[PDB]
Design an enzyme around this catalytic site. Sequence first.
Site, short mmCIF file in Angstrom:
data_model
loop_
_atom_site.label_atom_id
_atom_site.label_comp_id
_atom_site.label_asym_id
_atom_site.label_seq_id
_atom_site.Cartn_x
_atom_site.Cartn_y
_atom_site.Cartn_z
N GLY C 132 0.77 -1.24 0.00
CA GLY C 132 0.00 0.00 0.00
C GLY C 132 0.80 1.29 0.00
CB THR C 134 -0.34 4.21 -5.43
OG1 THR C 134 -0.90 2.90 -5.30
CG2 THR C 134 1.02 4.08 -6.08
N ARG C 266 1.97 -23.58 -41.47
CA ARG C 266 1.06 -22.98 -42.46
C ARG C 266 1.75 -22.82 -43.81
N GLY C 337 -1.69 -13.50 -39.68
CA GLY C 337 -2.61 -13.10 -40.74
C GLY C 337 -3.85 -13.93 -40.97
CD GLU C 355 5.20 -2.02 -10.58
OE1 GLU C 355 5.97 -1.13 -10.12
OE2 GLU C 355 4.56 -2.82 -9.86
CB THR C 357 5.15 5.10 -19.04
OG1 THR C 357 5.82 6.36 -18.90
CG2 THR C 357 3.76 5.13 -18.37
#
Lengths: 375, 365, 376, 362
Positions: C132, C134, C266, C337, C355, C357
Amino acid sequence: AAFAWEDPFLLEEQLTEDERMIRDSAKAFASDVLLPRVETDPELFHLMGQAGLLGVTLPEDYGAANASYVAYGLVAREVERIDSGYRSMMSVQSSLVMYPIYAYGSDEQRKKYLPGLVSGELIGCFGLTEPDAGSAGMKTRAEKIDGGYRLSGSKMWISNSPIADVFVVWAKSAAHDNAIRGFILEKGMKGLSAPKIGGKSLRASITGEIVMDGVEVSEDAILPNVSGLKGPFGCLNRARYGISWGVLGAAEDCWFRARQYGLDRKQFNKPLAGTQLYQKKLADMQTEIALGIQASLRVGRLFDEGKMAPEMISIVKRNNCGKALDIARQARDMHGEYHVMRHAQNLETVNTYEGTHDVHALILGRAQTGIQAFF
Amino acid sequence: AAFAWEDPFLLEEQLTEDERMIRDSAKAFASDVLLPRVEKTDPELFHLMGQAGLLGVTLPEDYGAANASYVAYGLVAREVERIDSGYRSMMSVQSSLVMYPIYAYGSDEQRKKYLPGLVSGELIGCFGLTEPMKTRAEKIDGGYRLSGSKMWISNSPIADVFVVWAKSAAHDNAIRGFILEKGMKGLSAPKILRASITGEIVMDGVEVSEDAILPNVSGLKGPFGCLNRARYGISWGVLGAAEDCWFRARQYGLDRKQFNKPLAGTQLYQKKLADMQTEIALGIQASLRVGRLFDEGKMAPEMISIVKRNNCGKALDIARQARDMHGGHVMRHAQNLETVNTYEGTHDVHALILGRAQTGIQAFF
Amino acid sequence: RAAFAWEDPFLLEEQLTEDERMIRDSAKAFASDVLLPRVEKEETTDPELFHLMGQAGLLGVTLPEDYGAANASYVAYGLVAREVERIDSGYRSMMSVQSSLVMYPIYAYGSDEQRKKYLPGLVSGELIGCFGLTEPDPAGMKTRAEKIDGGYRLSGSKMWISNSPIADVFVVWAKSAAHDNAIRGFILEKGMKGLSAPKIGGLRASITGEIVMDGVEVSEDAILPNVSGLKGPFGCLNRARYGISWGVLGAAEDCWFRARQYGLDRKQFNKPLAGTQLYQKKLADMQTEIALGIQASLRVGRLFDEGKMAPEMISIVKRNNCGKALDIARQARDMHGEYHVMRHAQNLETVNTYEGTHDVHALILGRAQTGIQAFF
Amino acid sequence: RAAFAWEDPFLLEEQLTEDERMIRDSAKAFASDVLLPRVEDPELFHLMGQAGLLGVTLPEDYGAANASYVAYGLVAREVERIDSGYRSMMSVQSSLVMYPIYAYGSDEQRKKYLPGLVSGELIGCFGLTEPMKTRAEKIDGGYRLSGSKMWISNSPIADVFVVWAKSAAHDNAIRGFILEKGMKGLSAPKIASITGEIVMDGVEVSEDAILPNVSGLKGPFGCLNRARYGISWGVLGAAEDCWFRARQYGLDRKQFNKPLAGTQLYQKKLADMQTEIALGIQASLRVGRLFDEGKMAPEMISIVKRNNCGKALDIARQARDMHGYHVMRHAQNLETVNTYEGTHDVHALILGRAQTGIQAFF
């Protein structure tokens, strides 16, 4: 249906006959006169002028082409296709020297200088920046004297000043309550000198000072129809418009050379341009040039309609210089040869000047938000 | 001089009065009808769009269509995708993949029968091309017998009208278009973005009369013309979602404070906003130009690859950048555009299309 | 020629100790046997998963064996996050919170009484903790601790607190009146009288809430004695961020491997997708960026163990690895795609955000080079 | 808290041995005393050699420093920090000439040629690339080599020529041959280093001129692998130089009465430079350690050569773009360096094939 890969959105059909003709004269000049040189000269100005490629937007009354801002853009494009240095000659002479004389000057002033500037017989320069930095609250002053003005101060980093016959100088005019006014100075004038500055950055260019040691002029040497930074900035804006076009021409040249090199160079019995990685790059060049041309075209049209805002110019100048430089570098990296390296070196310089990439970003930033982030 | 940051290059003054009205109409619809749905799959939504006059806007007034420009088609796509790509996707299929082949390749009988129901949105269509082509059409006395299965078809389970492409044996195995209806015998459509549904088209010897084939087209050219028009619409549409993201990111930046200053007062934030403005302004002039070329009858499919690839990519980048600016609707758009960037067709495929058009060499294989 | 493992270009395997490799194998067995079946079936809060992780021994790996912890290195801690986030960021997030935001401060700043009481249950996962700091408004913190006869009385509200509504142990930071309003740590328990943790309105396995303290009275032994000031909580965060820098490499690898395998399976034009230049270049970038990211996180892990970690180091790996990992998941997404790649990519968008930017860590580095702050 | 060095974020200094740090400091002092004044010559090979900076990984029996591959990298970095041309001198001399002579050569070939190459009294060049067509015909008592190599660094000033040719009787297998300047059919016309051809008009050599302990492209490739590794270290030096210059410049130039480096945009670029340089260093370091353990695989070199060349070039480009002399020089150098010894895309396709088992070159 027909597709022209070299002209994806058919610019050709968006242009008038005059615009196409004037571009053709620009292209013939560039190929016949400019190109042999690349494979600083006052005679080259006279050749450009005689070709009718200087001050194309000015009235026929001065021997000009009386053409659109779109045509001006087409001319820059054809010339910078050869070299940015040659385009720079035209940016200064047309947008930095003839435009303020025409737009802000008297009929006497228009008649004396414009014909000589259009022909390239007279060479001009634009004196705004001073030795301090990019700091405007300029120190050059114009004292009022009996019958005119006395100019004192120094301009620095002035394009073509050591070979200029005509000097458009901006100075705080005492008698206009220190407002910034424009003044026309001539080469022979007492106390006026334009010494060259040392160091090697573009082709066909020369930089120097404008030293005004109490230069006395009559009252008709002041540009009557403008005051404030509005004056020089109007010039800079028009130069940047032309540059946003010119770099597209050099961008194209790099694109075309990159394409042709990839067609000519073989590996594993197929051309380089037969590979995905190579083709993907060609596709990005094609796309960005096509977007850039549509934007500059649109700005030119707005110019001619008289609806240009300087923020529009920030967009095409920043975008096109950025994208053109990226194209020149990609083209460079696709080789390994000279002309692509030359454009790339040129564009690095072009991207720097007339407002950096980041400064135009913050101009647009301020215009969206009403908040300045310069400081 | 006046500067509008939201419309830097004055698109507003490049549009016809007819174009401005249809955009205002599209804008009113998206706002009054679409936005409440997304903020608080439906056959009734088709009828609403059709009733608003937003389906097949390029079609003649003879079918209750608006008889507008391809530019107007783009403006509608832009106003609709501004809310959600799903709503624009409804239009892509109905207008460009279903109504377009029926009008462009169809007989007067086919035009008169199907288009009015499609324009009003009372009738729903789907486009049958892609398979898990093997679908074939044997000639039978008085018509044709269709057999095969089409897969991953948009709106097929709720469609009344089926535009199906098949190799016709009665032609030298050439690709022909056939109109199938929901009530037909061998026909079934099992189910497999918002407001979207995909399914199959199963044809167990579906017999149709000789009047069911689209007489005026043959080869892959037929379905390709439809895709091209759909892609053109998409290139416009993603700019609307792009704008919504740009406008929201800008406004969020003015509203949100950090260090007692708005986020939008910072250099890093402003550069990102400048890039958004730039790319959207470039993308609009591009789609506009292609749209104008459409109306002049001068569209080449490679043009569409340019605007589709560029605008979908740049729109995705903007939505992604806007999402990242919300550190601490944009998530919706950003996710939607990821799907849009993928389909019909990918970024790399359009690049190789342009690569082949420049060089004369295909690099797909 | 010489042996090359494309899956491990720089042979991380030979840079690890035997104990570090063993705990990773352990994390890897837990991830495939327990976590992987869960992600294949979402919006459910399940407190028992904490007990599963704890029993598997993946909680507080750097902590002493006296508490039943693995006594492993910070490198090992990183490896575990990687093996776990490889499956899902939410599960890595469980451990960041539990290990670095709850166990680290109790162990590092707490008394032996506090260590003995709280750590064993947190290690096994029978206790769930939360962190705790913020507030809705970290220096101008409004949460306060009045000195009262026999202890402290805490009042205030914490916001955006991970796992607060399912938590047993609360590490709360507050301005302590008796310490001239200096920021102190307090250990609060779930049953206390004025304490509540409401969930907040609107990642996997994650639940966010508040910590509401309406005059919560605790004794004098509930305060963390060996720390004061923001140095305390910031120390917990830095360790969490170090773990994330590793973790995202796990999600990035998962995307890299799926994009590779998908391209092999693919076909297009009767050739595998991964047989084309454009696809292989994308694989080339993934391999490159993951391999760089690993050597970076590893070095920081080694500096952690030497006691030579500086916070700016963490800004480097957290910002880089989160950014490069997001770009890999996005590229992987676009190359398809389909379900797992999309899940990772969405997660990493959130991870890149929280955490600190990308831009925030750039300005931390910018300040560390120039001595000029550019935040405001 | 704990100390942080922004100029060295991951403490490279504490990952290096005492010998590596000393050899780096010696390389740095040399570059500063000798190279730096020049950027602001056959004798320069001798200067480098006397400094002990040529063939740093080679045994002391040839007068070499007998150092690690990490040290070799550190030296390249200190040298390219001044200018890429000077590092290229070492790349050729150490990795393209001395290595194959040492690794693939006879004991006689080592004793004869290596001490001189180490001292810098002898200059070498590396002949593989052509305008394979170069052939070595079997002749009584030796070989006759015919062909022309092009774009060979330092060939017009070389005393020693390592030339690769398809040797008939092996059969047409690629073998290595040691050629000397005075030889009959040998000429090297020219076309901070100098490039030329090696024109071989039926140059006849004895049987002891062949490099005995190698055949096939493995020979020349081992040489290129080592040069590229050196390059992946060297560009980090030009990159740092650009980064440090960009920073110091941003601190010195004020705009709007604040230094440029006090702004977010300028600072973000510095963080990107710092970050990419730290990653590149950790990578090249790991690869060096793998060299020394004898565990280097060429695909490793592709990762760091491609990455660091790409990333350094971007840093140099970003640094240039931030100068609204030395930064412009590095940027032009690094573009050529990114071009040669395998382009970015070729190394991508090298890595791609190693993951997929599919070649996408054609």
